Design a protein around this motif. Sequence first.
Motif, PDB file in Angstrom:
ATOM      1  N   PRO A 106       0.492   6.108   5.822  1.00 15.75           N
ATOM      2  CA  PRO A 106       1.474   5.068   5.535  1.00 15.75           C
ATOM      3  C   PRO A 106       2.659   5.177   6.503  1.00 15.75           C
ATOM      4  CG  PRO A 106       1.895   6.868   4.147  1.00 15.75           C
ATOM      5  CD  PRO A 106       0.583   7.186   4.830  1.00 15.75           C
ATOM      6  N   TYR A 107       3.228   4.043   6.897  1.00 18.53           N
ATOM      7  CA  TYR A 107       4.396   4.074   7.764  1.00 18.53           C
ATOM      8  C   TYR A 107       5.571   4.589   6.923  1.00 18.53           C
ATOM      9  CZ  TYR A 107       8.165   2.486  10.882  1.00 18.53           C
ATOM     10  OH  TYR A 107       9.281   2.450  11.674  1.00 18.53           O
ATOM     11  N   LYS A 108       6.227   5.638   7.407  1.00 17.71           N
ATOM     12  CA  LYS A 108       7.369   6.210   6.706  1.00 17.71           C
ATOM     13  C   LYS A 108       8.575   6.248   7.620  1.00 17.71           C
ATOM     14  CE  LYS A 108       7.295   7.303   3.267  1.00 17.71           C
ATOM     15  NZ  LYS A 108       7.263   6.484   2.024  1.00 17.71           N
TER      16      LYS A 108
ATOM     17  N   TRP B  30       3.952  -3.292   9.842  1.00 19.72           N
ATOM     18  CA  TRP B  30       2.653  -3.033   9.269  1.00 19.72           C
ATOM     19  C   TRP B  30       2.801  -1.901   8.262  1.00 19.72           C
ATOM     20  CZ3 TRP B  30       3.047  -4.808  14.277  1.00 19.72           C
ATOM     21  CH2 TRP B  30       2.187  -5.851  14.649  1.00 19.72           C
ATOM     22  N   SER B  31       1.983  -1.922   7.219  1.00 19.81           N
ATOM     23  CA  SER B  31       2.036  -0.933   6.158  1.00 19.81           C
ATOM     24  C   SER B  31       1.426   0.427   6.449  1.00 19.81           C
ATOM     25  CB  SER B  31       1.355  -1.480   4.908  1.00 19.81           C
ATOM     26  OG  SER B  31       2.054  -2.570   4.349  1.00 19.81           O
ATOM     27  N   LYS B  32       0.274   0.430   7.110  1.00 20.71           N
ATOM     28  CA  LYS B  32      -0.437   1.662   7.412  1.00 20.71           C
ATOM     29  C   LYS B  32      -0.955   1.666   8.833  1.00 20.71           C
ATOM     30  CE  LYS B  32      -3.680   2.004   4.300  1.00 20.71           C
ATOM     31  NZ  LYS B  32      -4.096   1.740   2.874  1.00 20.71           N
TER      32      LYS B  32
ATOM     33  N   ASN C 164       9.755  -1.860   4.439  1.00 16.06           N
ATOM     34  CA  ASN C 164       9.024  -0.667   4.810  1.00 16.06           C
ATOM     35  C   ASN C 164       9.827   0.587   4.830  1.00 16.06           C
ATOM     36  OD1 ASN C 164       6.900   0.988   5.567  1.00 16.06           O
ATOM     37  ND2 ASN C 164       6.302  -0.368   7.274  1.00 16.06           N
ATOM     38  N   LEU C 165       9.479   1.498   3.934  1.00 12.98           N
ATOM     39  CA  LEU C 165      10.145   2.791   3.838  1.00 12.98           C
ATOM     40  C   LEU C 165       9.105   3.890   3.971  1.00 12.98           C
ATOM     41  CD1 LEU C 165      11.593   1.404   0.698  1.00 12.98           C
ATOM     42  CD2 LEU C 165      12.988   1.678   2.746  1.00 12.98           C
TER      43      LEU C 165
ATOM     44  N   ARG D 231      -0.648  -8.620   2.924  1.00  9.45           N
ATOM     45  CA  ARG D 231      -2.074  -8.894   3.108  1.00  9.45           C
ATOM     46  C   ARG D 231      -2.657  -9.537   1.866  1.00  9.45           C
ATOM     47  NH1 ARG D 231      -7.853  -7.869   4.441  1.00  9.45           N
ATOM     48  NH2 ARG D 231      -7.660  -8.097   2.106  1.00  9.45           N
TER      49      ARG D 231
ATOM     50  N   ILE E  11      -2.495  -1.860  10.325  1.00 10.12           N
ATOM     51  CA  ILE E  11      -3.104  -2.754   9.360  1.00 10.12           C
ATOM     52  C   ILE E  11      -2.130  -3.162   8.270  1.00 10.12           C
ATOM     53  CG2 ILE E  11      -5.423  -1.910   9.678  1.00 10.12           C
ATOM     54  CD1 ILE E  11      -5.009  -0.105   7.321  1.00 10.12           C
ATOM     55  N   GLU E  12      -2.549  -4.140   7.462  1.00  6.88           N
ATOM     56  CA  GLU E  12      -1.779  -4.689   6.345  1.00  6.88           C
ATOM     57  C   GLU E  12      -0.280  -4.883   6.578  1.00  6.88           C
ATOM     58  OE1 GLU E  12      -4.292  -2.866   3.793  1.00  6.88           O
ATOM     59  OE2 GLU E  12      -3.708  -0.814   4.060  1.00  6.88           O
TER      60      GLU E  12
ATOM     61  N   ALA F 218       6.152   3.478  -2.006  1.00  9.28           N
ATOM     62  CA  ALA F 218       7.552   3.680  -1.670  1.00  9.28           C
ATOM     63  C   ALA F 218       8.224   2.461  -1.054  1.00  9.28           C
ATOM     64  CB  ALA F 218       7.705   4.860  -0.746  1.00  9.28           C
ATOM     65  N   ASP F 219       7.449   1.529  -0.499  1.00  4.48           N
ATOM     66  CA  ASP F 219       8.029   0.336   0.112  1.00  4.48           C
ATOM     67  C   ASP F 219       8.699  -0.468  -0.970  1.00  4.48           C
ATOM     68  OD1 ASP F 219       6.914   1.065   2.537  1.00  4.48           O
ATOM     69  OD2 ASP F 219       5.350  -0.494   2.509  1.00  4.48           O
TER      70      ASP F 219
ATOM     71  N   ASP G 164       0.486  14.435   2.257  1.00  8.38           N
ATOM     72  CA  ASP G 164      -0.112  13.136   2.072  1.00  8.38           C
ATOM     73  C   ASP G 164       0.486  12.027   3.021  1.00  8.38           C
ATOM     74  N   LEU G 165       1.647  12.290   3.632  1.00  9.87           N
ATOM     75  CA  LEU G 165       2.386  11.324   4.462  1.00  9.87           C
ATOM     76  C   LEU G 165       2.335  11.388   5.979  1.00  9.87           C
ATOM     77  CD1 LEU G 165       3.626  10.614   1.792  1.00  9.87           C
ATOM     78  CD2 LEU G 165       5.621  11.874   2.492  1.00  9.87           C
TER      79      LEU G 165
ATOM     80  N   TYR H 214       0.756  -1.254   0.000  1.00  7.45           N
ATOM     81  CA  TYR H 214       0.000   0.000   0.000  1.00  7.45           C
ATOM     82  C   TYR H 214       0.794   1.318   0.000  1.00  7.45           C
ATOM     83  CZ  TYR H 214      -3.386  -3.615   1.095  1.00  7.45           C
ATOM     84  OH  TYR H 214      -4.141  -4.763   1.049  1.00  7.45           O
ATOM     85  N   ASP H 215       2.100   1.243   0.220  1.00  6.96           N
ATOM     86  CA  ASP H 215       2.941   2.441   0.207  1.00  6.96           C
ATOM     87  C   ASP H 215       3.788   2.202  -1.017  1.00  6.96           C
ATOM     88  OD1 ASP H 215       4.718   4.558   0.577  1.00  6.96           O
ATOM     89  OD2 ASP H 215       5.532   3.810   2.489  1.00  6.96           O
TER      90      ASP H 215
ATOM     91  N   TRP I  62      -6.026   6.792   7.745  1.00  6.47           N
ATOM     92  CA  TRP I  62      -4.972   5.813   7.536  1.00  6.47           C
ATOM     93  C   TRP I  62      -3.770   6.410   6.829  1.00  6.47           C
ATOM     94  CZ3 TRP I  62      -5.753   1.664  10.292  1.00  6.47           C
ATOM     95  CH2 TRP I  62      -7.049   1.198  10.504  1.00  6.47           C
TER      96      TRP I  62
END
Lengths: 196, 196, 196, 196, 222, 222
Positions: free
Chosen positions: D134-136, D43-45, D195-196, C90, D187-188, C76-77, D154-155, C73-74, D132
């Motif tokens: 995104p993990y940054k 997790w993604s978000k 993960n970035l 997921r 989530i996800e 950027a990942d 947006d981040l 979902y990102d 929600w």
Amino acid sequence: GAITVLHCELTAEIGVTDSIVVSSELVMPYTVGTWLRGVADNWSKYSWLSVRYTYIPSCPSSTAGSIHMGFQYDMADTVPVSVNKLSNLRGYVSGQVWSGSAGLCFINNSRCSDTSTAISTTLDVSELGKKWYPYKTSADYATAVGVDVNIATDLVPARLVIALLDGSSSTAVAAGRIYDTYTIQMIEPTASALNL
Amino acid sequence: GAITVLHCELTAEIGVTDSIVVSSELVMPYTVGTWLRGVADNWSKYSWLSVRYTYIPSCPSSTAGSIHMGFQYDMADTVPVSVNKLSNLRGYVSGQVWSGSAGLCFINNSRCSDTSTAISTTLDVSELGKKWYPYKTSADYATAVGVDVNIATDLVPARLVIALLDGSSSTAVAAGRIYDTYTIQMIEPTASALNL
Amino acid sequence: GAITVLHCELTAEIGVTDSIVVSSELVMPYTVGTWLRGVADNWSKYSWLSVRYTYIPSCPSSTAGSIHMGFQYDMADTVPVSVNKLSNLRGYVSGQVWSGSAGLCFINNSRCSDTSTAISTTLDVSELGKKWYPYKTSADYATAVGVDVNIATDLVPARLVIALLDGSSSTAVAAGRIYDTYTIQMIEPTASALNL
Amino acid sequence: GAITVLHCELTAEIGVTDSIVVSSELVMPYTVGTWLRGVADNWSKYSWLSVRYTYIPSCPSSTAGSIHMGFQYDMADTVPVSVNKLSNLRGYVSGQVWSGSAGLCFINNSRCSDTSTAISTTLDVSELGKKWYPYKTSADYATAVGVDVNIATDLVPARLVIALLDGSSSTAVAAGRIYDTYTIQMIEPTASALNL
Amino acid sequence: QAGISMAPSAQGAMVRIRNPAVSSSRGAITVLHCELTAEIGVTDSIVVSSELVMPYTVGTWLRGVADNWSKYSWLSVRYTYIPSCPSSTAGSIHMGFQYDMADTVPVSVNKLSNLRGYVSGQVWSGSAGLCFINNSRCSDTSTAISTTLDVSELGKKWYPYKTSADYATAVGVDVNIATDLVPARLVIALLDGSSSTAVAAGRIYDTYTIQMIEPTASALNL
Amino acid sequence: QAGISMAPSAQGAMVRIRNPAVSSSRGAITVLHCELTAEIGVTDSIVVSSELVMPYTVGTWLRGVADNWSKYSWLSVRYTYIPSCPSSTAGSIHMGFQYDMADTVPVSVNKLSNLRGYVSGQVWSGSAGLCFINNSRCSDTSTAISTTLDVSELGKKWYPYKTSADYATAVGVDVNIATDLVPARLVIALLDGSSSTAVAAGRIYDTYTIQMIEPTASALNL
Ligand SMILES: [Ca+2]
Ligand SMILES: [Ca+2]
Ligand SMILES: [Ca+2]
Ligand SMILES: [Ca+2]
Ligand SMILES: [Ca+2]
Ligand SMILES: [Ca+2]
Ligand SMILES: [Ca+2]
Ligand SMILES: [Ca+2]
């Protein structure tokens, strides 16, 4: 998945001499008696629902001597060296080697009348430190305990200390037998050959 | 209090040869898989609410070979050496190395209708030794067990044994993979770097 | 107001080799497939009500190879580089390249009984970043992302990553196809020629 | 699919000097604290359900100086340059470096008595611009922001501006620490390495 | 009045410990008591310390009483810090619990802050926790530096009474042998002080309720 | 208790500013708010400072909001001092108002004491005035160092919104041109300190209620 067995079998033969002789039995399937030892091996873990040790006499009324029983719960604690210390333990009961017949009703399940004369004691299953223990062979137990006795705590629920003395002969005289009557729950089967 | 996670991830990759090859996996966060190993380390103890191993094939219908799985609970017990001996364990489950796709629905938890062929077994989470187990690393566990295997019963709830045989080549052929689907409760946070 | 469409169409053609090959597809109208790309362009924004990717085989039962799918979902990942890493996403779903026919019923929406083997995954339409996304063309998206990948989170809800490996040939063998079944709400009409 | 964590951890160590020193912390998992930084990466978000920053003192009653905190919501807006501008921000609270002990109850969840003296402030999760995010990683964020700060909108949901001044030494004197107490929904899942 | 605070020159707390409460139910015997457990001092660098939460080490009285029983179970265990220095004293105290003896002891307040039961506070405060020790009616304990064991989440209920000696030997073979014998350990960290040399800060008192079962002559208890 | 006082080691006041209250009646729009207005520091010699009481300079937020209206009128203006140092700090603060910009700024607490709204106080006190800023219910404000504008005695009711720039130019031609543009100025003096170098004492917050009228695009407002 829990498979339940109820049974009473000979657990130990008793002889009395004129000197104190302290002995102990681990309260685990393997040592409780040979029949159970063999059936319980086919399962990985167990839980004691009820464990009662009852002494039944086989000698003449003229046989001098007394039996004393009690429980210990931390295998690291020292085994009682005198009958005095023994009388401090939980479940202490002390009878005379020719008495105890009324305890027979615990062995054959017939309705018990007055059991105040039966030399019998039971394990406090609810105050044990865990409910499901692993089936252990005395050999493997021994090894573990050899490294450090504290390894026993995770393996066995309790220990039954027995003391016999006040006899009249320097040489053992057959006094009686201790039978064990238990209800056990066995779970997670295994081929017995692998069970240690 | 408790923090609950339900997740699925690759736990092991599988290959078949023409001779029995029994292997095993500890059922603890650190070894269940990479992801869980990672997040679980931030908590001190945990409790399995559910653990399920599902084998999923990746070979052609013409691949010879069979897979077998089961659980053991006394790390001291000998690990099975044959299918017969293994078939006795709890959660035994066997099947063709090219079969097992019906278990997919357990992985991405959908509606499972066709699950009679799923080569998937489940851990009896309630008959485990205790509820809260400490998070251990393979390294630390290894050392402890090197002193005495019984030191393991206080740390790991069970191990999954896997046996593969009936292959056609003496050199390993890719069969499939084992995935783990768990629900776990974690408690008592800790910085992961301190967790051994 | 909103105009809702539910439809199914070919989204991608698949081939297996003997080495991992991870690829991905943006989950937006323009790239989901040709038909949707076409009709969706007449509206300015849209919202996914349902998105499902179902893999359907076309190879013999003897074809070696496995397929893997999941969502990210990102944008950027980093995209997964292995099955282990991928199994964590997921909607992960894996299976033999020659398996998956049970998912046919999702395509021509019939009664789905045997769906335990369907290699089909679904998008978590409610945990998406926002509800209304703008219709973008591959070209425009590409340029934006070329400046900075993060510019993508405001435009695409997710991407489906696909990995194929375990094949027998170093040269691609035809395995199957991925079809997409969606239900989408579109709003704010526009002449398609203006829509970038 | 939503997995929820509640936790309070050290977020920043505070020192006071005789000059204004303005600093800021992005209100995102990665920067909120190292423990969360590590767990949330899997997790993604995420979505913030509750975020509260509380300052706890560690200095003597004789320590001169004051701390001021407040929130900013458009990363493109200029960071307050004076404590005056800072007092205009939402969530402004200003206390004296040796006080704030009553805030301890927010950190260990015990029932709070009178918290009117706690130097604590909270994030208006409902007025955030999206639920929600995104993990940054701060690295990736930095790059994005380098192209144009507006890419940050947006981040990240918000920014915590902190100002320390009125101290008595030209050299930093340890005043206290800011702990963050949050409830977050993750989530996800994803392998953290991606993960970035 | 709301929002206002006044730092005192020094806080005072008169500790007065009452008679231990012992009583036997049917099978179980219960003790309730307080004992001074540790002395505290601060330095300019961080110093982490730990205390096992088992009868033998929790208190000098408890140690000797609990030895007459084979096993025990903690009903409640609380550690409360009472200061003995002025508000001009620099320093802060931090507490938390660890449950796997093999884990590394924290080396920073950052790691520490993540532990269960974490609490921080100025080395010169905490008199508000007095009611826990003195047994008085607690007023605003909002600013007390006191923490408690999460007994329900402990590894098991009944633990065996162990002597530090026997425990120390066990742990020497492998630290994991501890898991089976002790429920947890209190970690204590002190820093933010001003002397390179320790400065007396205060002391910690332990208040507990324990259940003891299955009697044994003390001499046999190891 | 009557006649007894206890000097604390330090006073604490937790400032928490609430959302500005804006509302339009018929013609007039009213704002109510608080803003940090000035930072304070003491020295051993007297230092006098002044602040014009006009929207532009009263506060950073007000400045930008008030600019959208052509004229305004002060309904209430109050300056409250909140300390940020210990009771061991030497120094005193003094405030008062001047109304003819051409007058000389006071050069002593003696002259200062004669001004309208004069108030003095130890640089380490005044937390009692917190209720004015926080908006809480005021208890004993007896010891607060806070003063207010006598709005009814001001020169006129409606003043034009002016920017410091345009004002500064006007005043440069002749200071008397100020009379027509600004109602008054707050004078602040600090002395009785112990360092030749300034020592941070505290800060001043401004709480006001203003009426604004006749809209104009901001860009046109000078
Ligand atoms: Ca145990
Ligand atoms: Ca065994
Ligand atoms: Ca650990
Ligand atoms: Ca468009
Ligand atoms: Ca957006
Ligand atoms: Ca990311
Ligand atoms: Ca003992
Ligand atoms: Ca104007």
